[PDB]
Structure 1
Amino acid sequence: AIHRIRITLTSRNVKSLEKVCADLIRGAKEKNLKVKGPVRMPTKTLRITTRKTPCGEGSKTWDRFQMRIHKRLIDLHSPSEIVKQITSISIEPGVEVEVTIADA
């Protein structure tokens, strides 16, 4: 029986995230699952304001570093074991892929 499994994908490298999300959607249809598609959750812009000048006599030089993480979920109406079986294999580097029993 099917079991609507969320596949949450978090990364900061978009085209790394995109090339793995391409693997998950196709490989779910390569060996048949639900295929649903990329539910584009918005990116989170982690912005931190820093001093560019230590021992800051002179000019107030402000420096800001941003880091953008990128979320998306893939809910799959598909049989619970072989959802996580086909997807979670063969992807070790670069991209966190979170298959999820919930949204049952």
Structure 2
Amino acid sequence: HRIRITLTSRNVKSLEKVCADLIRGAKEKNLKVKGPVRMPTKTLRITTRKTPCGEGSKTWDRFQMRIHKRLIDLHSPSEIVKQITSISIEPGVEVEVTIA
């Protein structure tokens, strides 16, 4: 009865807040829960040009997009995981449930 939930978001502080919420919920549900696994992050490096024309100094810029994906491991039955997945949502994260 191994079930896993993957947590990804645009931001990092909201991600840690949501991860703390699910960890605290699995702690008050009184079950065997693994702690928050800290997956490495990925950095989107985008380089464009400042000038619409070809006039002036050759001044590039650097564009950074930070993606932060995490996962937690649960040992709960399916309906409880579905209920805590369907509760406490936000428009920053995506919920995703794997049964394995």
Task: Give the alignment's TM-score, normalised by structure 2.
Answer: 0.87
Runs (4 or more) in structure 1 with deviation over 4 Å come to none
Shift of 1:99: 2.3
Q: Deviations over 1:52-81 (max 9, x none)?
A: 111022211101111000011112122122
Shift of 1:11: 0.8
Shift of 1:44: 1.0
Q: Which among 14, 39, 42 is matched to residue 41 of structure 1?
A: 39
CA RMSD of aligned residues (A): 1.5
Q: Is this contact kept in 2: 1:47–1:67, CA < 8 A?
A: yes
Structure with more of its chain in strand, by fraction: 1
SS where residue 71 of structure 1 aligns? strand
Change (3 A) 1:100 1:88: farther
Match of 2:9 in 1: 11
Aligned positions, number: 100
In 1: Cα distance, 2:20 partner to 2:97 partner: 15
Structure 2 residue runs without a partner (length 5+): none
Shift of 1:91: 1.7
